[PDB]
Amino acid sequence: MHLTPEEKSAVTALWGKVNVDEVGGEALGRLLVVYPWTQRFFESFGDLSTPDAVMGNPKVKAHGKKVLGAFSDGLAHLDNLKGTFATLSELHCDKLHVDPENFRLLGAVLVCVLAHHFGKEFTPPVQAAYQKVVAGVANALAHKYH
Amino acid sequence: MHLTPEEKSAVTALWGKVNVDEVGGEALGRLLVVYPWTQRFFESFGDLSTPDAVMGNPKVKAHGKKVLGAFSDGLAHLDNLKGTFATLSELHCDKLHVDPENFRLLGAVLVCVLAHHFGKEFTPPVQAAYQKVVAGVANALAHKYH
Amino acid sequence: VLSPADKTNVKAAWGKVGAHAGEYGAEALERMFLSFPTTKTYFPHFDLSHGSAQVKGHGKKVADALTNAVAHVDDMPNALSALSDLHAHKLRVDPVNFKLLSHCLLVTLAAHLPAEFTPAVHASLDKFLASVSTVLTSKYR
Amino acid sequence: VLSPADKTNVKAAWGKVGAHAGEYGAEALERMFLSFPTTKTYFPHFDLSHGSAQVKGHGKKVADALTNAVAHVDDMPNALSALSDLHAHKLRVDPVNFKLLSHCLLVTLAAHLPAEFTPAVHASLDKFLASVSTVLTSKYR
Numbered sequence A, B: 001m002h003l004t005p006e007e008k009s010a011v012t013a014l015w016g017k018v019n020v021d022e023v024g025g026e027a028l029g030r031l032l033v034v035y036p037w038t039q040r041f042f043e044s045f046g047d048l049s050t051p052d053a054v055m056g057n058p059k060v061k062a063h064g065k066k067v068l069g070a071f072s073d074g075l076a077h078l079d080n081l082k083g084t085f086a087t088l089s090e091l092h093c094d095k096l097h098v099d100p101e102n103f104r105l106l107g108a109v110l111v112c113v114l115a116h117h118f119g120k121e122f123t124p125p126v127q128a129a130y131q132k133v134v135a136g137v138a139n140a141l142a143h144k145y146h
Numbered sequence C, D: 001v002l003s004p005a006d007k008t009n010v011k012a013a014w015g016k017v018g019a020h021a022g023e024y025g026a027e028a029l030e031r032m033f034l035s036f037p038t039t040k041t042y043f044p045h046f047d048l049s050h051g052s053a054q055v056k057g058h059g060k061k062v063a064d065a066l067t068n069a070v071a072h073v074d075d076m077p078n079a080l081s082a083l084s085d086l087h088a089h090k091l092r093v094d095p096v097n098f099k100l101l102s103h104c105l106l107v108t109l110a111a112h113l114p115a116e117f118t119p120a121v122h123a124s125l126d127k128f129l130a131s132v133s134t135v136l137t138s139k140y141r
């Protein structure tokens, strides 16, 4: 990454306070609600007819936890996101057919969830470092598309 | 910059046929005409009120030639665009204050210009090589922004 | 919004396309697949090989729709309603991809109509495709 | 298109902002400048340092305009004619930038209106800022 030691420490430190279970479920669900078209990949999850139905859908919450899980582990290889997400990049391309733009939508949603959760703690400088990470992650995941 | 050798030969072969003076004037003029907001940087160029006023403006033509001149040099250092464009990146940021999105608009216009000029010779695969190139140059020009 | 001038420009350039619309539609697709590989994620079910009949078939459909929007330039929202519904509810193509196809359509026309692809016409065609894209995406949320 | 639910959601949310809109305007700009430094290209004449009065002042201006937009949620195009003009013919900010400020505004609201920033409200505000953005760039060409 093009993260400053100071930027790295800010990311790292806020992350330590995150409940991936809850943030994962919330980020994915918000995604399905704010940008309804992302629902095209989760038809098998059920009823996503309403915010309520999305936010309550356990399949959603559990997929959300899987995604933030993988994200969370990528924060440990911040100096090689490319290599950490290589296999996941191929899968997303070759098996899932997920347009990389979705990676960017989620990232933005992720940042809104963190702000939502941390209020005061999520300062302009801290958001700036997270913006760099979400962009970094999205790029890494889209890297193997062909 | 993922230019395969064959993509690089293709860029270079076509570039051999270009009249930079001419293409430069056309690309810059067309930019000012398709995305008129870009005219914000050239209020000292005079009359840009209509397409003919823009396309024929001696100042637009001279500036276009300058711009494409710097671009051609870039094409001889496809290996090190960032280095090649560093002082220009700084200038555009610090002195000129040019939003980098401008570099991407110009790249799209340039691709249309090359298509216009080369007709059938600007094949799907040649366009794809040039798409990688204009993106690499835009990125190089934006690398020093802060 | 398209001005009288724009409308004239578009009917004129599209007029010249005539009977080649179908082929130009297929070509724009191929250019898109080659330059913006991420767009391929929407056609997992297609043979995207060079000269694919699926691509040929699809290029024609897209070209027919554009031809229909030109024919109804003063009532596009209504002329394209059906297609707007399909994209919003079934296909669910991310909006950013419309700009990519638009771009490849402009390249294609440029490559085929040298005499008509003037600065003025280029500008009108760009506003036109942007408006088509806007209609097709209007019912997304 | 803003649904009635949307209009309600927006008015509620903005209702809670109250006397802090100016501070939230200022905070959104600050967040924009830091996260998307390319946006600073439009403010060479400002002191973009933390707590600058130029930024505070501008923050108020923006906040105020949003207020006026919420109030005329039914007639935005008309309520914002002048602003659409200013941006299209004077400022000429590239359209991609509106999405950046919109995002920093959501983040700001989220961080300040926890209880109120529900998923449905988040969706509504986003559409709202999108509509505002559309209005502001509608006369660009």
Ligand code: HEM
Pocket: A038, A041, A042, A063, A066, A067, A068, A070, A071, A088, A096, A098, A102, A103, A106, A137, A141
């Ligand atoms: C932060 C970015 C993301 C990360 C780290 C990520 C990671 C993952 C992981 C670890 C899996 C598990 C699959 C396996 O190992 O077999 C998965 C599956 C999947 N992801 Fe992604 N993902 C991301 C973004 C997205 C987005 C934005 C979408 C669509 C909106 C998406 C759609 C899917 C789908 C459809 C599956 C398959 C789940 C199933 O089998 O039902 N992913 N992802």
Ligand code: HEM
Pocket: B038, B041, B042, B066, B067, B068, B070, B071, B088, B092, B096, B098, B102, B103, B106, B137, B141
């Ligand atoms: C391929 C991308 C570009 C290249 C290689 C390029 C190159 C150059 C060069 C070589 C100069 C002269 C430097 C000097 O005065 O010392 C220049 C100046 C300038 N460029 Fe760029 N340029 C590019 C894109 C753009 C775009 C897209 C815009 C605006 C939309 C722009 C705005 C300007 C302006 C306003 C000046 C100064 C003109 C003056 O002398 O008053 N450039 N550029």
Ligand code: HEM
Pocket: C039, C042, C043, C061, C062, C065, C066, C083, C086, C091, C093, C097, C098, C099, C101, C132, C133, C136
């Ligand atoms: C202005 C641009 C566009 C136009 C005029 C257009 C028009 C159409 C038309 C006429 C069809 C066929 C509907 C039918 O079955 O009768 C279609 C289908 C489709 N379009 Fe769009 N479209 C546009 C943009 C896009 C973009 C940008 C994408 C994705 C990159 C896309 C993806 C699809 C897909 C996946 C289908 C279904 C194809 C099939 O399964 O046969 N469209 N479109």
Ligand code: HEM
Pocket: D039, D042, D043, D058, D061, D062, D065, D066, D083, D086, D087, D091, D093, D097, D098, D099, D101, D102, D132, D133, D136
């Ligand atoms: C949410 C959308 C926006 C709204 C409601 C908005 C509103 C305003 C308002 C109310 C003014 C002041 C008019 C006056 O001075 O009388 C203004 C000016 C200005 N806006 Fe916009 N704006 C928006 C988006 C943007 C964006 C994204 C940018 C650039 C990144 C921008 C750049 C400017 C600039 C440079 C000025 C003039 C500043 C000065 O010299 O005081 N605006 N805008």
